[model samples]
Each structure stands twice: as C-alpha cells, then as structure tokens.
Target: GDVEKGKKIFIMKCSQCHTVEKGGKHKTGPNLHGLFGRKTGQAPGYSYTAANKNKGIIWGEDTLMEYLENPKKYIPGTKMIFVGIKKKEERADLIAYLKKATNE
Candidate 1:
C-alpha cells in the first residue's frame, strides 16, 4: 500500500531532490538511496543542519513518519524547507516505499 502511493508522491515531490537507487547522486537534497534504517544526517557529501546533526534520531517507520508529518516540529532549525505531508495515509505510504526501496 505504502509502496504504491509513495511512488506517486516521490515522483511528484521528492524525486527532484533525491534518488531511490543505490549510489545515486545528490540533487538539492541528500540522496535517499539507502535511507531506511540509516541514522539521521548521515548521508555523505551533503551537509546537515545543526538541528539534524544534534537531534539523534534514526531513520525508521516511526521516526520517518513523525518527521514527515511536521519536519520543522520534529527537528527545529532543520534545513528541510518542506513543511510536511498533511495526510496520514500519504505519509505512511511514502515511508513504506522508502523502506521497501532502500531494502531496510
């Protein structure tokens, strides 16, 4: 379910900034090649904001869901300018796709 909807959302919103495949290049944002289960702010080359670097959050269903709901609220001063996904189902779907695509 998530994988299906997530693909749509990723194409619509996230694809410009990230790539799902392994060893993908960074665009405006960090590459999401292997995001699931990874530690926050750990993506190479891309610089992380102090908020993310100090937040100590891990990438997983729960953490990703919370962050997607309200990025600013989850990590104050984060560089992620996008507000968040308002729809709960969409967020779930996106996370599902991310988890599946990343093989995490």
Candidate 2:
C-alpha cells in the first residue's frame, strides 16, 4: 500500500476522530500514536466503551484490518460513528500510513 495515498485516506476517513502523531491530542476518538502492538482502549486520557476496554485484543495489521471494516461488529458498543471502509486497498493504505505515522 502507498503511504502517501494512505495519508489522504486517513484525512478523508479517519482524521476527524483520530490523530496519528505521537503526543497528538485525542479528538472524538483517541489519539492513535503507538497503535500497533498496543492493547485496545489503551490510549491514555480517553474514555473507552466497556466492550473496547474488555476486548483485550492487541493492535496490529490483521486486527486493525478487521476492525476497520466493521467497528461495531468487532467490539459491539464502540462510540466511534464512522462507517467502515469498504475497499481492501483503501484499508491497507490507511494501515500503512498509520503504522508509520503512529510510531514516528
């Protein structure tokens, strides 16, 4: 996946609620820095749903791919309201952007 293309996808699809930079502020959703390998609902200073907090899944490409396609189905009570991305390529690009942006 293309990181540049993924950045655009993130702006269109995820920038509203998520911030990828380290120490970035949390918006409607949690700041997404350090996303990969982090536990669900682990971002500090954010209020996560019981479902998210209890899910106990680690964040990574596979988990994120599934979650991004259907957040409510994955966790069953997440407050996030955006519809899931339908295209596999788009999701892959976004994940690529996220992996770099969050860790940087």
Candidate 3:
C-alpha cells in the first residue's frame, strides 16, 4: 500500500521537478541518484544553495523523513521551491520508494 501510494505521490507531487533515475538530468531539482546514503547537495551539475551544502547531511530514512515533511523549516534558505510535503505517511511512502527504487 505504501509503495502504490508513494508512486502516486511521487508522480503527483515530486515529478514536476524531481527524477528518480540514476544519472538523470535535473529539471528544477537534482537527479535523485544514490539518494539513500548520499550526501546532500553533492549531486553533479546542480547548483546548491549555501544552506543545503553546508548542512552536512547524509541521506537516510530519518533525515529524509524530517526534511520532506518541511524542507524550508529543515534547511532554511534552501533553493527548493517546495514548501513541504505536509504528511508523514506521504513522506514515509516517498522515502520508502526512494530506498527500494534506487537500488535498480
């Protein structure tokens, strides 16, 4: 159920800017290759704000969950225009999918 819900959420909320593919081109956001365990603001060719790069974060479930729920609040001055996801279930589903999907 979470996978299906995550798929729907990603398409509806995330696809407008983000991509889940490896070495994928960034639209408004960076390509989420190696998203899990990846360091924040390290994606190639993407310009990250000082706030994000300096945050010194490693991507994991806990960090992802907190960040997705409220990006601006988590990392102030972030360039990502998304205000927040606003739902823990949605965040969990998306993070879960990111964990499972990026492996392939």
Q: Pick the lDDT winner.
A: 2
lDDT of each: 0.84, 0.91, 0.85
Off-target runs (Cα >4 Å) in candidate 2 are none
Instruction: Rate residue 47 of model 3 by lDDT.
Output: 88
Sorted by lDDT, highest first, which candidate order results?
2, 3, 1
lDDT per residue as tens, model 3, 8-94:
888888889988887778998888878788888998888889998998889999998999888998899998888778878888898
Predicted candidate 2 versus true structure: per-residue lDDT over 7-33, tens digit per residue: 999998889888888899988999999
Question: Is candidate 1 or 2 superior in lDDT?
Answer: 2
Off by over 4 Å in 3: none
True lDDT of residue 11, candidate 3: 88
Q: Compared with the true structure, what per-residue lDDT tens digits does model 1 show for residues 67-91?
A: 9899899999988888789998999
